[PDB]
């Protein structure tokens, strides 16, 4: 039962040979470029977050006894919640509410900024692989 290891009609059900697909090097270069873009987006988000936290600290150091107008505090709290620093913004919204400077539009503005749009953008471009469906899933853990 031993075998034998071998190897004008034309097969009409065999398709023509054509060049489909990429090279190993091209795939590696695609990976490299996507990784560089991911680094660029992470660097942008980190720089912006650091700048906003620096602004928060400078403003707090200035406001040890002086109270700033409500609008600058509203903007800073909105930016903090936008960058995901919600716990840093609870005091600002609490004092604005106690002072009764917030209104219908401002409350909705703060609750919307609380969804972390900038952090969501960073997650989308970096960790969610630009998947809008997975961005929501990845934002929920934070």
């Amino acid at each position: 039962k031993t075998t034998v290891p071998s190897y004008k009609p034309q097969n009409q059900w065999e398709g023509v040979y054509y060049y489909s697909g990429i090279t190993k090097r091209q795939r590696h270069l695609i990976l490299l470029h996507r990784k560089r873009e991911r680094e660029a987006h992470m660097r942008s988000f980190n720089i912006s977050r650091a700048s906003v936290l620096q602004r928060l600290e400078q403003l707090s150091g200035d406001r040890k006894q002086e109270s700033l107008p409500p609008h600058v505090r509203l903007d800073l709290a909105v930016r903090l919640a936008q960058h995901g620093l919600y716990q840093q913004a609870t005091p600002i919204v609490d004092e604005l509410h106690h002072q009764k400077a917030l209104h219908a539009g401002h409350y909705a503005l703060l609750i919307n900024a609380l969804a972390c749009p900038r952090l969501g953008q960073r997650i989308l471009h970096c960790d969610a692989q630009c998947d809008p469906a997975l961005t929501y899933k990845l934002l929920g853990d934070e």
Partner: protein, 201 residues
């Protein structure tokens, strides 16, 4: 983005084991990517406003299922196809996927005897309906030869033999059967002549 990502997810989904006998059937679903791209071009949605990952996958699908007329007119030259063959031989280990069993391993009936001796089984095999006019006399004379092997009914001609293969000749059936009939006529006549000579001698 969402629709194209759904297309890619469907294409990448593997299929049941029995249907995975030949290839990943769902890859065909990437062939609609150019269709959706043309629909976007007509709807005014720019394709540059797509994620880099989705664009990588879209370009993969395009290079898989798309060619232009200029490419097509040269698509099939012996030079390109033989380059494909030689490249497969040189590097199949880098790009070939191969580099279920009971489907190909199943006992099969075997015709032990030759074809002429045993007619092969596969060869032996080969008004308004709803409101029900039988034999309307269908005049076929108002509007407008076969040949057998000559040995169908003869006690001397063996019923079985290699001459049965002549039954599946079409282009020159008339001439081949005429020659066969002449040969059998001559052989029978010579055999009878020998019988008479042997008896008389």
């Amino acid at each position: 983005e969402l629709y194209l990502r759904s297309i890619m997810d469907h294409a990448n989904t593997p299929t049941s084991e029995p249907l995975q006998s030949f290839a990943n059937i769902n890859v065909v679903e990437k062939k609609k990517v150019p269709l959706v791209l043309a629909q976007m071009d007509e709807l005014g949605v720019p394709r540059t406003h797509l994620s880099r990952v989705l664009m990588d996958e879209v370009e993969d699908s395009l290079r898989k299922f798309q060619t232009y007329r200029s490419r097509f007119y040269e698509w099939g030259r012996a030079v390109k196809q033989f380059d494909f063959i030689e490249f497969r031989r040189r590097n199949g280990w880098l790009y070939d996927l191969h580099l279920a069993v009971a489907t190909a391993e199943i006992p099969a009936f075997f015709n032990e005897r030759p074809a002429w001796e045993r007619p092969p089984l596969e060869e032996t095999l080969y008004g308004d309906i709803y409101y029900d006019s039988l034999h309307d006399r269908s005049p076929t004379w108002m509007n407008e030869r076969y040949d057998r092997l000559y040995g169908v009914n003869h006690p001397d001609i063996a019923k079985i033999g290699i001459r049965r293969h002549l039954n599946v000749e079409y282009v020159n059936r008339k001439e081949v059967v005429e020659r066969d009939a002449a040969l059998m006529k001559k052989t029978l006549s010579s055999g009878r002549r020998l019988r008479h000579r042997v008896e008389s001698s």
